[PDB]
Amino acid sequence: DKAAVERSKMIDRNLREDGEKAAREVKLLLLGAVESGKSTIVKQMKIIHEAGYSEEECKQYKAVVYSNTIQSIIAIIRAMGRLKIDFGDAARADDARQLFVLAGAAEEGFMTAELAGVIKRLWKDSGVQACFNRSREYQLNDSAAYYLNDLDRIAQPNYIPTQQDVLRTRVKTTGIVETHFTFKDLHFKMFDVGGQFEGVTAIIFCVALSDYDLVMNRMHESMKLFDSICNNKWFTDTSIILFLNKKDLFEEKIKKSPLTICYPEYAGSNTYEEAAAYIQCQFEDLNKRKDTKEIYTHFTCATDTKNVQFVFDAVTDVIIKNNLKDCGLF
Ligand SMILES: Nc1nc2c(ncn2[C@@H]2O[C@H](COP(=O)(O)OP(=O)(O)O)[C@@H](O)[C@H]2O)c(=O)[nH]1
DSSP, X not given: OHHHHHHHTOOGGGGSTTGGGOOEEEEEEEEESTTSSHHHHHHHHHHHXXXXXXXXXXXXXXXXXXXXXXXXXXXXXXXXXXXXXXXXXXXXXXXXXXXXXXXXXXXXXXOOHHHHHXXXXXXXXXXXXXXXXXXXXXXXXXXXXXXXXXXXXXXSTTOOOOHHHHHHOOOOOOSOEEEEEEETTEEEEEEEOOOOOTTOSEEEEEEEGGGGGOOOOHHHHHHHHHHHHHHSGGGGGSEEEEXXXXXXXHHHHTTTSOGGGTOTTOOSXXXXXXHHHHHHHHHHTTOSOTTTXXXXXXXOOTTOHHHHHHHHXXXXXXXXXHHGGGOOBO
């Protein structure tokens, strides 16, 4: 392989007594709007380049999974009111109340066969499904459907959250979060600064593809942010990687939502292929120094480990082929 040969022409470890034991380092900054997938990418590095999440670890996320599910159903139910949606069967109107009774009596996330029932019956309702399917009209968790459909398993008294349950969680992050992991004998120091560094090695910029029909426009606020980044002088010598994330939700959304909601001038077919290609182009086009700087775009499903591993392996080769010389030995 070419990246292997590239690595091989370095002579800097020879300048260190025990240089063959030295640590080559890669400072990687993770950027993107809130909920673009940054924290999930961080968890996937744990999962892929470390042990991941142990049973004991996953167990710590149970109330978060419960918290997420609860918030998800309450958001849909509360939406029905503002959107004026009727329950498919008006018996549900009594469970809706029960949801607020059970939720309104706890400080923390929980699950009971009782609550499980109320939520199952509500989720199964046509009117609720009608509200759910109109989610671009209100604030709703991305994993809402994921959890809601697996209620039975999640509800089980002796339920243990899977790694995926852990990756699907929405957790309030505050501050920079730094993760260290080794991949290909490269010691990465990964920094997630939150959607809210003059010489970083590479930058992975996350974009939630599914935010397109969310109705300044969401997609455009991310475009505005990516413009600032890839064009910033500090990042001139930094590998700019673009993760057009949530391709799974976008694949299912573009089916019934037109890209024109986001890009009014879009005239291509409303297909996953053309619509996604358009978005990439829209972003890579913000690059001023095209002659000089290249943007590395990858369509990702951050909650899909295989995809993230595949994509990260690719991302990593680009760093070796393009930035190793700027990478220090410690
Ligand atoms: N379906 C799907 N959900 C995703 C994807 N990436 C992240 N998520 C979910 O989006 C939510 C917010 O992502 P998170 O990593 O917390 O975003 P951050 O605010 O950028 O850190 C969580 O529920 C994640 O599990 C993706 O590609 N597909």
